[PDB]
């Protein structure tokens, strides 16, 4: 059971307490503003068109490729398209093998449940997308449903670096910065149960809630209730930038744009506001559209804007896809049949929970 923070024991780069103070003792105006654009759930031939259109070719003002985090769930994911996203410099993260309903399952999952749903997905993902296992570091639990200590224990066991499942509404201005779980967390638990054990090793990357038009909090853009009309491009542009300014003109805590792709392609006016927002921050000299792992990397060794701008761009190790089209595949638990596009040789059976590489019978 974790104790309150021993500000003398908890030291970078290995340990940090839950706090709204800027890492490294930096002043806000010397602190880079990070933006983490993220997309949940399965990668397929439809939503990849949105990702190519609004993300490809972008760069930050330091000429590094602008990043984004894909919390990928396994079912109906085209792993050749995952490989493509990885090779354009975007981060591939875990969102479970099954994404199974109901949400209540994830609140209670056993250690073994999350080993098989998340821990095993790391090698599943590296295998079928043919990307370095070391590049897989992030976790978002389905339905934003925390699992107490359990998910963080699994992360420690499988060298996953950070979780981005845990929103805050009380700690948004000044915003709560990432922290480790060596000690007790001050973060509010909107979606219980939250971890209270001392679990050294993984990081919490809080989802700092947005504020909607009536000041109600929302964790994801497509979860905001009081919102401009879907056809009102200018209203959505002002809505996005107002939430962004709360960070940029505040303590500069990482600003999230957490969405499902459906919300972007279903609403062309929102997509246009979204594109304009990205165009603006790509032209700002102290704002950076990055992968979520790069936020943890900065918190671990915080540097002022001027030195951050001198750091080398992320290194994206190229990894070729040798594509295979596989099927019909079936599983022992699945009842369904499947076809798959992967960057490896075809498995004998459908990869699933308890058989993550489709290898066994
Ligand atoms: C997570 O780990 C902590 C630390 O072991 C667990 O803490 C227990 O919490 C209950 C109250 O819910 C206390 O009655 C126990 O005494 C605590 N144990 C210890 C050793 O202090 C916690 O229950 C675990 N599970 C969850 C879901 O948080
Ligand atoms: Zn999801």
Separation of alpha carbons 267 and 177, rounded Å: 31
Dist CA 68 CA 53 (whole Å): 14
Q: Which residues, at least 6 apart from 361, have a Cβ–Cβ distance to it below 8 Å?
A: 332, 348, 349
Residue with tokens 């090779």: 87
Atom of ligand 1 nearest to the CA of 149: 1
Task: Answer yes or no: is the C-beta of 196 below 6 A from any ligand 1 atom.
Answer: yes
Q: What is the DSSP letter of 119?
A: I
Q: Is the CB of 250 under 6 A from ligand 1?
A: no
- CA 282/CA 245 separation, integer angstroms: 15
Helix (H, G, I), strand (E, B) or coil at 263: helix
Protein residue closest via CA to atom 12 of ligand 1: 196
Residue nearest to atom 28 of ligand 1 (CA): 148
From residue 317, alpha-carbon distances to 61, 87, 107, 197, 252 in Å are: 22, 8, 36, 36, 30
Report how far residue 304's alpha carbon sits from residue 207's, in angstroms, rounded to the nearest whole number: 23
Contact 135, 91 (CB under 8 A): yes
Q: Cα–Cα distance between 188 and 256 in angstroms, integer?
A: 18
Which tokens is 298 given? 């900065």
Q: Kindly identify the ligand whose nearest atom is closest to the C-alpha of 196.
A: 1
**DSSP one-letter string for 41-101:** S---TTHHHHHHHHHTT-B-TTSPBP--EEEE-STT--HHHHHHHHHTTPEEEE--S--PS
**Cα–Cα distance, 191 to 136 (Å, whole number):** 25
By the 8 A CB rule, do 98 and 74 touch?
yes
Ligand nearest to the CA of 1: 1
> Of all protein residues, whose CA lies closest to atom 15 belonging to ligand 1?
1
Q: Which residues contact 25 (CB under 8 A, 6 or more apart)?
A: none
- Closest ligand 1 atom, residue 195 Cα: 28
Residue of 246, 247, 226 whose CA lies nearest to 236? 226
How many angstroms from the chain centroid is the CA of residue 108? 22
Pair of tokens at residue 45: 């031939």
User: Where does the chain have alpha helices with state H?
Assistant: 47-55, 79-87, 103-108, 111-114, 120-129, 150-158, 233-248, 261-265, 268-282, 292-300, 305-310
Element (H, E) at 338: strand 337-342
The closest of 178, 177, 179, 170 to 198, measured between CA atoms, is 179
Query: 188 with 194: CB under 8 angstroms?
Result: no
Q: Residue 23 phi/psi, 5° resolution? A: -55, 150
With contact defined as beta carbons under 8 Å apart, do 193 and 38 qualify? no
Q: 192: Cβ below 6 Å to ligand 1?
A: no
Sole residue written with tokens 């994830």: 106
Residue 87, both tokens? 């090779």
Q: Going by C-beta distance under 8 Å and a sequence separation of 6 or more, which residues neighbour residue 231?
A: 267, 269
Residue 94, φ and ψ in degrees, nearest 5: -95, 135
Q: Which of 70, 99, 46, 77 is nearest to 326 (CA)?
A: 77
User: Two tokens at 119?
Assistant: 């821990």
| Resolution for this PDB entry, in angstroms | 2.4
Q: Which of 149, 151, 184, 189 to mutate to test the pocket of ligand 1 (most atoms within 8 A of CB)?
A: 149
**Experimental technique for the deposited model:** X-ray
CB atoms within 10 A of CB 329: 19
């Amino acid at each position: 059971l974790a104790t309150p923070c021993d500000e003398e024991a908890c030291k970078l780069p290995d340990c940090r307490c839950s706090s709204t103070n800027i890492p490294g003792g930096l002043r806000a105006r010397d602190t880079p503003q990070f933006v983490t654009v993220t997309f949940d759930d399965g990668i397929n031939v439809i939503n990849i068109e949105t990702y190519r259109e609004v993300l490809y070719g972008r760069s930050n003002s330091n000429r590094c490729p602008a990043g984004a985090t894909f919390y990928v769930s396994h079912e109906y994911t085209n792993y050749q398209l995952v490989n493509e996203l990885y090779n354009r410099g975007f981060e591939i993260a875990l969102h479970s093998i099954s994404h199974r309903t109901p949400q209540a399952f994830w609140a209670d999952a056993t250690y073994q449940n999350l080993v098989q749903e998340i821990g095993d997905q790391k090698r599943q993902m590296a295998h079928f997308a043919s990307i370095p296992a070391s590049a897989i570091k992030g976790v978002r639990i389905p339905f934003l449903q925390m699992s107490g200590n359990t998910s963080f224990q699994v992360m420690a066991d499988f060298d996953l670096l950070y979780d981005c499942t845990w929103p805050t509404t009380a700690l948004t201005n000044p915003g709560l910065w990432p922290y480790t779980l060596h000690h007790e967390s001050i973060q509010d638990c909107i979606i219980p149960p939250c971890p209270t054990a001392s679990i050294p090793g993984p990081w919490v990357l809080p989802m700092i809630s947005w504020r909607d038009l009536n000041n109600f909090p929302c964790s994801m853009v497509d979860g905001c209730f009081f919102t401009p009309d879907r056809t009102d491009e200018e209203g959505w542009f002002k809505f996005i930038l107002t939430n962004f300014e709360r960070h940029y003109l505040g303590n500069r805590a990482p600003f999230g744009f957490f969405v499902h792709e459906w919300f972007i392609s279903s609403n062309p006016a929102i997509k246009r506001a979204f594109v304009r927002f990205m165009d603006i921050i790509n032209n700002l000299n102290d704002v950076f559209m990055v992968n979520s792992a790069e936020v943890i990397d900065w918190v671990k060794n915080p540097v002022p804007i001027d030195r951050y701008r001198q750091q080398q761009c992320k290194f994206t190790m190229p990894s070729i896809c040798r594509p295979s089209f596989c099927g019909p595949l079936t599983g022992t638990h699945n009842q369904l049949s499947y076809y798959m596009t992967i960057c490896n040789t075809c498995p004998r059976n459908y990869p699933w929970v308890g058989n993550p590489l489709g290898q066994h019978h």
